[PDB]
Amino acid sequence: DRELNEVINQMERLDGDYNNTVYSSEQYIQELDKREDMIDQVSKKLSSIEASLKIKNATDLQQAKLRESEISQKLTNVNVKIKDVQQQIESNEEQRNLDSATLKEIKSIIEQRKQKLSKILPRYQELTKEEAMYKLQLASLQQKQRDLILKKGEYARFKSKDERWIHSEIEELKSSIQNLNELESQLQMDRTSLRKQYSAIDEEIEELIDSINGGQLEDFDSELIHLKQKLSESLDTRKELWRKEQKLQTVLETLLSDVNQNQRNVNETMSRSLANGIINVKEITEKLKISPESVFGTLGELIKVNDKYKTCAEVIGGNSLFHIVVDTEETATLIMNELYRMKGGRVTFIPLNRLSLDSDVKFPSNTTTQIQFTPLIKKIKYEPRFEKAVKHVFGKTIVVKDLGQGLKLAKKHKLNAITLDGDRADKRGVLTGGYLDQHKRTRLESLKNLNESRSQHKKILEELDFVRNELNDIDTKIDQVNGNIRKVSNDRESVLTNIEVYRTSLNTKKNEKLILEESLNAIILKLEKLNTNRTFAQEKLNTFENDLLQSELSKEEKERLESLTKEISAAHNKLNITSDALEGITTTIDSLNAELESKLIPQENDLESKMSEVGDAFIFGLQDELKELQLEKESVEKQHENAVLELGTVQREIESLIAEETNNKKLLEKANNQQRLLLKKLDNFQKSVEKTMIKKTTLVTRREELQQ
Amino acid sequence: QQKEELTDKLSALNSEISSLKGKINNEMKSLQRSKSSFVKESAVISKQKSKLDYIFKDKEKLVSDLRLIKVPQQAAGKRISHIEKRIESLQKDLQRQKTYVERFETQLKVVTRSKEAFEEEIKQSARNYLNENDLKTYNCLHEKYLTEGGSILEEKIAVLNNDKREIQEELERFNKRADISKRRITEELSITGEKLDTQLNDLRVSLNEKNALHTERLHELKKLQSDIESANNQEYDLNFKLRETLVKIDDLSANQRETMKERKLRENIAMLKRFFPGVKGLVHDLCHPKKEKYGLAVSTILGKNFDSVIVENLTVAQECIAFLKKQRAGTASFIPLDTIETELPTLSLPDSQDYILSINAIDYEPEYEKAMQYVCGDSIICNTLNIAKDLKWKKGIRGKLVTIEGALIHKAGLMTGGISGDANNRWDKEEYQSLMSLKDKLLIQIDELSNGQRSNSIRAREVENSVSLLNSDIANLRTQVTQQKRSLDENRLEIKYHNDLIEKEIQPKITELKKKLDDLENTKDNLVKEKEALQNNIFKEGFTIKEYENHSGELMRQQSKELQQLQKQILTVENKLQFETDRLSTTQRRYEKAQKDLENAQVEMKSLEEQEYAIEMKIGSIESKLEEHKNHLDELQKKFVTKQSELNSSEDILEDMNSNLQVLKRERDGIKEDIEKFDLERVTALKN
């Protein structure tokens, strides 16, 4: 009876064939798993890229809205500058039209005035000739008519005759009255001298006024203009800083939101028993006295590990990633008691004050055959001060290439063993292991994100402090500019008030000095008249006294009287003829001369007004041309900058949209491929499970058959 | 024997009926899914069309808004031009008024001058209406007249000289008075111009003050709106903290799903047990939790193995791990019975200080009690924290001792504490709605925050504008102060000129009185001369006209001088009329310029009104079209939400059907293959 043995051998051959089929299916599943791992890595990269793309969409879209608002504001400023340039061009065109019109009018008026002046130059060739003659005739009449009156008076005086003189009495009048005239001369001496003193005083006052009339005001105005320009530049810089600070605040808020989202994602993984513990230990930390900064946070943020074995760390880390280190044990006990309505779960503390039981550990790596063995402490960056605690955690956790060798060395030496691929073994005899997906202890990965978020928050706080300092500086500069402007205005007002008082005083003193000079001229004329009267007295009365001092006869006197009468008649006739000719010439010429003078008077005033207006218009036109050129240059520069900025923003928006569309399409394709791969993997796993069940049944049947 | 076969056949028939029903259900679900996919395709097509229409409408609205904004700049320019035109018109009206007053004054002066010239001509005409023997008689007549009145003639000559001096003084005073009058007229014109400028400045200052008050009110309103936005943001932040508590409840539900995934790994281990020999299972049910004392305690300390599994052989552990790799099951911890031998003999019962030891409070059979005493080690339990500290710190032995409530000290001295009040919760489907509501609220809050940021930017711009307005107001105040100082100086100068003119007139009154006295004396002298002439007439039968070579000739010369002065006054009146005509020509040119400017302003205003009306009509049409499109898009979005909910329900139904089909297929593999194995065993038995 050997057919049972043949059946057993056939079953063994079938089991071997099933094992070969399982190996082929495992190779196919390994290829599919490599494809699925590549697809999953691509999908994670695409999901990160899409989250970044959406965050960029929101943030850079607010930024692009702000940039478009700034570009529109620049375009509106350029449009306002162009409107102002057009207004200045219209003002210049009106000024040029007024120049042309008023200049034709001024040319006509100047031609008329020059014709009148040329006629009046000929009129003077005529008026001077008429004058010379009229003045000569008037002098003759004064030397004839007044001479005639004097001769008549002399004849009347000579008419009186007393044989038994009165001349002595006349001498008294020649002496006393002349003495009175001398007293009048004394009045002239007291007036001419007084007039000279007043003239000297007026000259000194005029010199003093002219000295003040003269520099400082121009320098003050220039300084005020420079201060105003500096204030405008400071205001522009402050506006730019305000825009930069607003953008910084917006991006900081976006970063804070992203950090909060990342923290929530990280917390989504931990068991809530210890999540609530973390929360409670936190608000207790910010509640009670933690001034010495005894809290050092979780283990993860205090150590980094080489990525090549990072997985290992995490699997050997586990809950140990969340160890908290505190300076003093008493603090930990007090905190734990203060969880007196405990609403959270697991939470551990490791005091530094009594940190002990960290026994010394010696690594046998000195000998050979430990190349496969890699101490983990060699791959960790940490603060040396905590070495003991760290050693308690990752010290004695060894890395092995083979699980059997790891167990052998664990038996030889009491250390926890694990493989690079994550086959965690226990020194005490337990064994651990299992398949691990791409998900892991993301807290360590999220620890870097949290640190970056904290750094960004610190940078945002520094930027806010700088913005506050800049705003304070801008306010101080504005206050200083306003104070300087007010001081300059007050100084200019005081200088102008002093100058106006000086000018009013100068005008009043000049009117007074003109009145005094007219009085002095009148006094000089009176003194000349008094001297002439004294000479006439000394020539008539003194001469008569001298002659009579050496008759009651007037033979020669009678002849002189007859000659005087004849000369008086001749002078009357000559004066009549003169007066007639002079009046005719005057009516002929002086009427037109005065008419021309009157016309030129209003004409002269109109010409002066036109000249002043033309000068002001020319100065204003030059200034407006310079301002228009500067404004045109500035507007061209601003338009170029705005166009460049708009083109850049449009290009960035188009690129972002294209990238978003491509990412969405790639994500959809990757999702479809992943679904297909998952279906294939599920089918393969079901087939493998069926094959394993069949193999188990065959083995059971073979054992039952061999039992006999 | 055959009873098992009959039972297997009945079970197979029932499984086949169930599989047929499940296949029918799956076919119906597939048809429904295809219909839903077609509906979703149509819905997304409609949504894309609506989005394109909305994009076109938004582009049109943005174009209209930009056109209107440019219209704001054109309107500002037109307003500036109209303000300039109104200022020019006011200046032209003030001119017209002053020029008309001056023209009336000049016409009155011209009429007076013409009347004076006519009167002078009439007087001259009235005024312009002596022999050999007569001369012989006049010789003796004049001789006698002189002999009689030489003193009278001398007095008359002196009076004439004094009158000439007084007349010279009177003309000097009159010239001074005329100069003061001309200065006063010029000062009055300057004061009128300065008063017009000051009135314009005062109107500008009032307008600036009104604008500053309006801007301050607008800034206060903006600050109040910003404060209200900040308060609403704080309220929305509190509401978002409340919504994050709902997100936290959703995370707890995901934690329940994670616990279910942990449960799944354990029936996979049980499947391995059915496939591998002599496996025990999880340790949760291998412990005694009765008495409700330090019940959780042990679990806490034993947590690392409290979720581990006991297996026969370490080789079995490795092959199970390989199976986990092959079929992607999961990760767990294994304790094989072939390695526990390490630390069995630790069965000491030393002094316990009247306290319970871990093994004492656990149910067991020999190898499980081996396993638990191995894993526990030196685990001890105490009653209170103070008792634990007294029994631990005071002693030199360090170990894993825990309190009744959970506080524990590790073998290395890690003091630890914590207790949680669990709240078993479900309602993930309700959370799906709560999460969606929270997301919508967060989106609304983000939109509100963006609006608040825009409002803050607008407020900053308004603050800058207010600062500029304050600077302009300060400049205007300085200009007004300067104008007031100039007006005060002009008033003081006018007062001084008036006082000087009053003093000159007072002096002119004395001069006129002296002239009148001299004229009276001259009249008396003329009466005396007339008496002398009448006395001489006793022999006469003239003299005033005979010396018309001197008396009436001088009178005619004076009359000619007066006529020349009247002609000069007429020429001055003609020059004033020419000045008035030139001012009227300038005013007519200004009227033409103002008419052209008013026509241009009317054309610009008409163009602006037409552009504004067109923009308003376009904006209204776009708003109506956008409201209709938004209503259509809201209806489409509601339909799409309903379709998405239906698709989710269909997907859940399909997942349930697939799970049922997989269970049935596994049973058939575990039943149909079981039936085949039973048949093979029966056939083998029949071989005997």
Residue numbers in the entry:
A (entry chain B): 236 to 399, 402 to 451, 456 to 791, 795 to 952
B (entry chain A): 247 to 375, 380 to 791, 797 to 943
Report text from the authors:
Cohesin is composed of two rod-shaped SMC proteins, Smc1 and Smc3, with a dimerisation interface at one end that is connected to an ABC-like ATPase domain via a 50-nm-long coiled coil. Interaction via their dimerisation domains produces a V-shaped Smc1/3 heterodimer whose two arms are connected by a central ‘hinge’ domain. Cohesin’s association with DNA as well as its abilities to hold sisters together and extrude DNA loops are facilitated by three large hook-shaped HAWK (HEAT repeat proteins associated with kleisins) proteins; Scc2, Scc3, and Pds5.
Folding brings a pair of helices within Smc1’s hinge, namely the end of the coiled coil around A520-F526 and another short helix around L564-R578, into close proximity of a short stretch of Smc3’s coiled coil. Though folding permits an association between the hinge and the N-terminal Scc2 sequences, which could in principle stabilise the folded conformation, we also observed similar, if not identical, folding in samples lacking all HAWK proteins. A 5.5 Å structure of cohesin’s coiled coils in a folded state enabled us to identify a pair of residues within the Smc1 hinge/Smc3 coiled coil interface, namely Smc1R578 and Smc3V933, whose substitution by cysteine led to efficient crosslinking by BMOE inside cells, demonstrating that folding takes place frequently in vivo. A pair of residues, Smc1R578C and Smc3V933C, were viable both as single and double mutants, and gave rise to efficient BMOE-dependent crosslinking between Smc1 and Smc3 in vivo only when combined.
